[PDB]
C-alpha cells in the first residue's frame, strides 16, 4: 500500500512548439516537498539533449535511439536542422525534475519561420529571451552548454535575459559546460585563462557562478593545488565520444568520457535546493507556480519595451 505512483519511460512536452502551455505532467507528480529543478541552454549543435539524457536516466554505453530526450539524427545533420522543439519535461525516480530547451538563435528555426513584428528576425530573439527568463525564474539550476570556448555573444544574451526577467531577489546558479573538449583544453595553463576570462566577463552578473561545483576538488587534476587558480568558477568540461606493449591505446590527455559524465551527474544531484517564492512549495504547487509564471511572462510589459527598441 506504498508502491510508487508510476515510472516515466519517455519525456513529455511541457510547452508546445507554438509557445502554448501543456498541462499533462500532473499525472506523474506527488505532494512531496524539496524538489530540484534543472534546466539547460545552448546553441544548435552543442548537445543539450544528449547531456540531459545522460544525466537523467541514461548511460553512455546505451544507444542514442532509446534516449529519454530525442537527439539529432544523422539524416538531420546533413540538412542543418534542429531536433528539439519547445520545452520538454522528465522526472527521475529521485524526484528530480529535468527541463530541456530548444536552441536559441538557431538558423533552423529562422529558416522554418521564413516560409510562414516588422521582420521575422526579432521573433526568434524574443523567444530565446522568454525561455531564458522562464528558466531563470522557475528552475533551481541552469546549465549552459557551449560548443566552442568564448562565443563572446552568450554572455551579453544572458545578461540581457536576466535584465528583462519577470521578477530579496532570487538568482539561480549558473553552470558553464564546455562540450566536445580536446586535449589542449585540459591543461592548467589554459584552465587559468578560461577561469580568468569567465570571471572578468561576468563581474556584475548577480548570478551564483562561483563557490559551487568546483571540478578541481573532483579529482580531475591530481596534483593541481587550489591556490593555483585566482577564482575557480563553476566550469566543467565534457570530452568527445570515446606482447602487451603493442596493444597500448592512444594517448588522449583527458579523462574518460564515462568518468567525467558520472562525476558531473553526481555533482549536479548533490547540489543545493534553495526556496523559490516566499513560501514552501510541493511538486504540484511548483507546477502551478511555473504555469502562472509562464502565463505572466507571455503577456509581460518589459518584453514590449524591449520590442519597440528593435
Amino acid at each position: 500500500k506504498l508502491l510508487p505512483p508510476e515510472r516515466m519511460k519517455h519525456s513529455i512536452k511541457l510547452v508546445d512548439d507554438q509557445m502554448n502551455w501543456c498541462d499533462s505532467a500532473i499525472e506523474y507528480l506527488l505532494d512531496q516537498t524539496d524538489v530540484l529543478v534543472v534546466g539547460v541552454l545552448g546553441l544548435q549543435g552543442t548537445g543539450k539533449s544528449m547531456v540531459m539524457s545522460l544525466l537523467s536516466a541514461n548511460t553512455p554505453e546505451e544507444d542514442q535511439r532509446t534516449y529519454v530526450f530525442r537527439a539529432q539524427s544523422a539524416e538531420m545533420k546533413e540538412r542543418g536542422g534542429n531536433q528539439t522543439s519547445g520545452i520538454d519535461f522528465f522526472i527521475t525516480q529521485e524526484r528530480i525534475v529535468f527541463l530541456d530547451t530548444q536552441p536559441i538563435l538557431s538558423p533552423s528555426i529562422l529558416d522554418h519561420l521564413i516560409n510562414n513584428y516588422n521582420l521575422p528576425h526579432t521573433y526568434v530573439e524574443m523567444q530565446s529571451l522568454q525561455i531564458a527568463a522562464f528558466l531563470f525564474t522557475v528552475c533551481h539550476v541552469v546549465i549552459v552548454v557551449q560548443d566552442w570556448f568564448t562565443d563572446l555573444s552568450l554572455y551579453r544574451f544572458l545578461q540581457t535575459a536576466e535584465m528583462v526577467k519577470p521578477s530579496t531577489e532570487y538568482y539561480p546558479h549558473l553552470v558553464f559546460l564546455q562540450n566536445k573538449a580536446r586535449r589542449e583544453d585540459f591543461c592548467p595553463r589554459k584552465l587559468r585563462q578560461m577561469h580568468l576570462m569567465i570571471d572578468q566577463l561576468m563581474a556584475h552578473s548577480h548570478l551564483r557562478y562561483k563557490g559551487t561545483l568546483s571540478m578541481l576538488q573532483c579529482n580531475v587534476f591530481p596534483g593541481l593545488p587550489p591556490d593555483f587558480l585566482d577564482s575557480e568558477v563553476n566550469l566543467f568540461l565534457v570530452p568527445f565520444m570515446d606482447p602487451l606493449f603493442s596493444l597500448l591505446p592512444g594517448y588522449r590527455g583527458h579523462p574518460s568520457f564515462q568518468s567525467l559524465v558520472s562525476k558531473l551527474r553526481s555533482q549536479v544531484m548533490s547540489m543545493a535546493r534553495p526556496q523559490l517564492s516566499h513560501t514552501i512549495l510541493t511538486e504540484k504547487n511548483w507546477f502551478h507556480y511555473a504555469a502562472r509564471i509562464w502565463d505572466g511572462v507571455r503577456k509581460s510589459s518589459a518584453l514590449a519595451e524591449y520590442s519597440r527598441l528593435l
Partner: protein, 213 residues
C-alpha cells in the same frame, strides 16, 4: 536608462529620515534595475537630504539633566544677540520645558529653576541671582577663578595658575595642573557664629521635611 528613469518616479513619490530613505531605496531597487542604476540611485538619494531633514530636523541637544531640546533645529544666540524665532533656522536658547525648585547657596531661599543646558547656568547664574536676594551679605570663602592677564584668553587645548589659558569645564582629577575655570561651581558661606545653630530646634530654613532639619 529607461528602466531606471521609470523606477525613479515611483520612489520619488514614496517619501528619522533614515527609515524613509531606506524604504524608498528598497522600493526603487525592487521596482527596476539595469546597467546604469547607480546614477539613478544617487540622484534619488541626494534629492533626499536636500529636501529631507530640514522640516523634522529636531534639535538633538540634551540638558545637563538628560532631557532633549523641544525645539526644531535652531542656532544659539551669539554673545549680546537677542533670540529671533522668525529666522531660518530660528535663533533660540535650548529648552527641555522641565522645571525644578532650587535653594540658594546658604539654603534659606528657594526659587523655580529651568533645566540647564550650560554649566554656568547650572552652577553659577541661578545661584548668583538668588544670592543678590538672600546670602550676598554673608561672609564668603571665595574659590580661585581664572583671572585673564590678556583681553582675549584662550580655552586650554586638551605652579602659578595660568593667566592666559582657562579651563573650559569644571576642575577634576583628569584636568591639566595649574588651570582654573572662569567661575567656581562651589560656594562656601558663613551663616553666623557657632551659637546660631540650636541643637534642640535644628536649622530654621524653609523646604525641610518635618523633623529632618
Amino acid at each position: 536608462e529607461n528602466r531606471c528613469q521609470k523606477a525613479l518616479p515611483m520612489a520619488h513619490s514614496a517619501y528619522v529620515h533614515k527609515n524613509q530613505l531606506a524604504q524608498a531605496l528598497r522600493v526603487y531597487s525592487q521596482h527596476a534595475r539595469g546597467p546604469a542604476f547607480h546614477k539613478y540611485a544617487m540622484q534619488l538619494h541626494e534629492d533626499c537630504y536636500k529636501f529631507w531633514s530640514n522640516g523634522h530636523q529636531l534639535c538633538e541637544e540634551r540638558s545637563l539633566t538628560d532631557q532633549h531640546c523641544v525645539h526644531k533645529f535652531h542656532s544659539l544666540p551669539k554673545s549680546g544677540e537677542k533670540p529671533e524665532a522668525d529666522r531660518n533656522p530660528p535663533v533660540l536658547y535650548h529648552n527641555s520645558r522641565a522645571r525644578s525648585t532650587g535653594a540658594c547657596n546658604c539654603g534659606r531661599k528657594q526659587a523655580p529653576r529651568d533645566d540647564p543646558f550650560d554649566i554656568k547656568a547650572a552652577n553659577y547664574d541661578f545661584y548668583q541671582l538668588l544670592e543678590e536676594k538672600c546670602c550676598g551679605k554673608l561672609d564668603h570663602i571665595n574659590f580661585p577663578v581664572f583671572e585673564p592677564s590678556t583681553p582675549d584668553p584662550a580655552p586650554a587645548k586638551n605652579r602659578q595658575a595660568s593667566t592666559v589659558e582657562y579651563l573650559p569645564g569644571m576642575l577634576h582629577s583628569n584636568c591639566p595642573k595649574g588651570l582654573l575655570p572662569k567661575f567656581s561651581s562651589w560656594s562656601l558661606v558663613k551663616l553666623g557664629p557657632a551659637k546660631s545653630y540650636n541643637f534642640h530646634t535644628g536649622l530654621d530654613q524653609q523646604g525641610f521635611i518635618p523633623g529632618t532639619n
